[PDB]
Amino acid sequence: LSALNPELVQAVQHVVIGPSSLIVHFNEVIGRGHFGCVYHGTLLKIHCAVKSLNRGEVSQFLTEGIIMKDFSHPNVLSLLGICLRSEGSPLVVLPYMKHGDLRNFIRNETHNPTVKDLIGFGLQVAKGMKFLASKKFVHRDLAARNCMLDEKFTVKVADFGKLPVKWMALESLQTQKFTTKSDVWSFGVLLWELMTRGAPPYPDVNTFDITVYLLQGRRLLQPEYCPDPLYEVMLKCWHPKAEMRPSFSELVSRISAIFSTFIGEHYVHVNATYVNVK
Numbered sequence: 248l249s250a251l252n253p254e255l256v257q258a259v260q261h262v263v264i265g266p267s268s269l270i271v272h273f274n275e276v277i278g279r280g281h282f283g284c285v286y287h288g289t290l291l292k293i294h295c296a297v298k299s300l301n302r303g304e305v306s307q308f309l310t311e312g313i314i315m316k317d318f319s320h321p322n323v324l325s326l327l328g329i330c331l332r333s334e335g336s337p338l339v340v341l342p343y344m345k346h347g348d349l350r351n352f353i354r355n356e357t358h359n360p361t362v363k364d365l366i367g368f369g370l371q372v373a374k375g376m377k378f379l380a381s382k383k384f385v386h387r388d389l390a391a392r393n394c395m396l397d398e399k400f401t402v403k404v405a406d407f408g409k410l411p412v413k414w415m416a417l418e419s420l421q422t423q424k425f426t427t428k429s430d431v432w433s434f435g436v437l438l439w440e441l442m443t444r445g446a447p448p449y450p451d452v453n454t455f456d457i458t459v460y461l462l463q464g465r466r467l468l469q470p471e472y473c474p475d476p477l478y479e480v481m482l483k484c485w486h487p488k489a490e491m492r493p494s495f496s497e498l499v500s501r502i503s504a505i506f507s508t509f510i511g512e513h514y515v516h517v518n519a520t521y522v523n524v525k
């Protein structure tokens with residue numbers, strides 16, 4: 248529309264994908280959810296994922312896209328480009344992730360992860376977060392459902408895009424303010440999700456009052472296959488004082504030590520009480 252904002256229109260220019268150099272297979276759907284949608288696509292012939300807005304809002308869309316342009320790290324999802332379709336909503340083009348999101352992947356009964364594999368995934372998320380934190384970028388919705396998994400089993404932190412209260416730090420639930428320290432709280436929950444193989448956090452608890460629940464003096468239970476030292480790390484991520492939580496560099500350090508101790512002998516099986524739980 249150009250009448251959007253010169254500055255943004257120019258920034259989107261250096262990453263523009265000519266509508267003729269990308270084919271969208273609207274027939275082959277991938278994502279599809281509240282607001283936007285995801286489709287398979289070909290780029291010139293690289294396989295890709297094409298995010299669209301099903302819909303001011305277009306501006307936030309393009310804006311969220313431009314920020315991704317500086318995300319260059321093996322553990323952070325990259326942007327191929329943004330295609331300005333002269334027929335509909337602009338599109339965001341992403342590399343194809345053969346294994347989809349991390350939560351659905353670990354939840355799969357046909358998969359046979361070990362303690363080591365799962366800790367490894369957490370290690371990769373932490374590396375991605377460490378990069379993001381160094382760029383002063385606050386995620387706000389860090390969870391296993393927002394982490395992608397490619398063909399080499401490399402984890403990419405992302406955001407599919409009504410608060411995810413169950414991953415939110417105490418101060419954020421109380422204030423609505425987000426920081427890197429509240430991302431650490433979310434990361435601890437992400438660790439729990441991995442070790443439980445994608446179980447829903449606080450099954451019994453209502454979204455409307457996780458705050459009251461947490462203030463009673465509670466935290467998530469140690470999953471059955473979670474090593475003590477990793478649980479000790481989870482509890483640190485959930486420190487009541489935000490400044491007392493470890494940084495992502497510390498987490499990378501600590502988790503990488505725990506990970507090195509395993510050899511791939513301990514298989515992780517789903518909990519019977521968590522099965523089919525929504």
Ligand SMILES: CCOc1ccn(-c2ccc(F)cc2)c(=O)c1C(=O)Nc1ccc(Oc2ccnc(N)c2Cl)c(F)c1
Nearest residue numbers: 277285296298308311312324342343344347404405406407
């Ligand atoms: C308009 C802004 O869009 C953003 C903006 C910022 N970040 C962002 C936020 C924080 C970070 F640390 C890094 C990136 C994003 O991740 C996205 C996004 O669209 N992500 C997204 C994710 C999965 C998708 O689905 C795929 C994709 C590939 N392969 C498969 N199989 C599937 Cl299922 C998908 F299509 C789109």
